């Protein structure tokens, strides 16, 4: 299947790093953050990637080009207005086609094996969930067997990893413009159409300098 990497975020919490460098292109261990995803995706057998962008977008295209150096074919979905995650995915659907695709929040650094998702999967969406960051119980969702439901307090909830397989039909109808992805996932969940899994390996949402350091720390433990 195809993959989409979300890369339209402005990274305001990463400043001043993101003043002249798009977040996707910030180096983590001598390598641009998004290039971990491109290499992982190519290793996992993915050959076609869609990347949306907004903030400093043309720098992303300039740097990655057509993706041939990664053994990929990349298409870009430029966004001129703030579309958010859901609206942005929707805007890119023409490039993705009608088949389920792998969706990867580009801000993430992880050792999750993307090739696990090319196995028989369940529903309109299949979500990779991880331990709640910061040692809290808030999270987003709960996982019962393979079935994902909406979170409830802090007894045993999990956090959405930003790694998933989505069915384009998830966006069936859908307000053409700017909207959120989570709300759509809960309608699917409400209909028993969302499966999931709990990944217990390394995962960092790289949204701050502190998260960047943590990712570097873990990446340095893997090299050894």
Ligand X SMILES: O=c1ccn([C@@H]2O[C@H](COP(=O)(O)NP(=O)(O)OP(=O)(O)O)[C@@H](O)[C@H]2O)c(=O)[nH]1
The footprint of Mg ion (CB under 5 A) covers: 9-10, 107, 205, 207
Question: By CB under 6 A, is residue 210 in contact with ligand X?
Answer: no
Question: By CB under 6 A, is residue 139 in contact with ligand X?
Answer: no
Tokens describing residue 211: 């998260």
Question: By CB under 6 A, is residue 106 in contact with ligand X?
Answer: yes
What string of DSSP letters covers 76-114? EEE-SS--HHHHHHHHHHHHH-SS-EEEEETTEEE---G
Counting other chains too, the contacts that 129-137 makes at CB distance below 8 Å and 24 or more residues apart are: 129/158, 129/159, 129/160, 129/161, 129/196, 129/197, 129/198, 129/199, 130/158, 130/159, 130/161, 130/198, 130/199, 130/200, 130/203, 131/158, 131/159, 131/200, 132/157, 132/158, 132/159, 133/159, 133/205
Whether omega for the bond prior to residue 81 falls within 30 degrees of 0, making it cis, is: no
Indicate which of Mg ion, ligand X, ligand 491, none lies near residue 110 (CB less than 5 to 8 Å, by partner kind): none
Nearest-approach distance from CB 5 to ligand X, in angstroms = 7
Question: Phi and psi of 26, rounded to 5°?
Answer: -70, 130
Rank residues 112 and 160 by Cβ distance to ligand 491 and give the closer one: 160
Nearest to 68 by CA among 53, 49, 45: 49
**Taking CB positions, which residue lies at the least distance from ligand 491?**
162
Rank residues 48 and 107 by Cβ distance to ligand X and give the closer one: 107
Nearest-approach distance from CB 33 to ligand X, in angstroms = 9
Question: By CB under 6 A, is residue 111 in contact with ligand X?
Answer: no
Residues engaged in binding ligand 491 (CB under 6 A): 85, 105, 107, 140, 159-160, 162, 181-182, 205, 207
Nearest-approach distance from CB 177 to ligand X, in angstroms = 12
Indicate which of ligand X, ligand 491, Mg ion, none lies near residue 25 (CB less than 5 to 8 Å, by partner kind): none
Rank residues 13 and 186 by Cβ distance to ligand X and give the closer one: 13
- Position among 2, 3, 4, 7 found at the interface with ligand X (CB under 6 A): 7
Question: By CB under 6 A, is residue 107 in contact with ligand X?
Answer: yes
């Amino acid at each position: 299947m195809k993959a989409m990497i979300l890369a339209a975020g402005k990274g305001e919490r990463m400043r001043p790093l993101t003043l002249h460098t798009p977040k996707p292109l910030v180096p983590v261990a001598g390598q641009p953050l998004i290039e971990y995803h491109l290499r992982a995706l190519a290793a996992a057998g993915v050959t076609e990637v869609v990347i949306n962008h907004a903030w400093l977008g043309q720098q992303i295209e300039d740097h990655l080009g057509d993706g041939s150096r990664f053994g990929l074919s990349i298409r870009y979905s430029p966004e001129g207005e703030p579309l958010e995650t859901g609206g942005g995915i929707f805007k890119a659907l023409p490039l993705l086609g009608d088949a389920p695709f792998l969706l990867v929040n580009g801000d993430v650094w992880t050792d999750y094996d993307f090739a696990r998702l090319q196995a028989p999967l369940q529903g309109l969406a299949h979500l990779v969930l991880v331990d709640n960051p910061g040692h809290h119980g808030r999270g987003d969702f709960r996982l019962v067997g393979e079935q994902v439901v909406d979170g409830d307090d802090a007894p045993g909830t999990l956090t959405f990893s930003g790694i998933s397989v989505l069915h384009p039909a998830l966006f069936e109808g859908c307000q053409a413009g700017a909207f959120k992805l989570a709300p759509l996932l809960r309608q699917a969940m409400a209909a028993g159409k969302v499966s999931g899994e709990h990944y217990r390996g390394h995962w960092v949402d790289v949204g701050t300098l502190e998260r960047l350091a943590e990712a570097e720390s873990l990446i340095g433990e893997r090299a050894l």
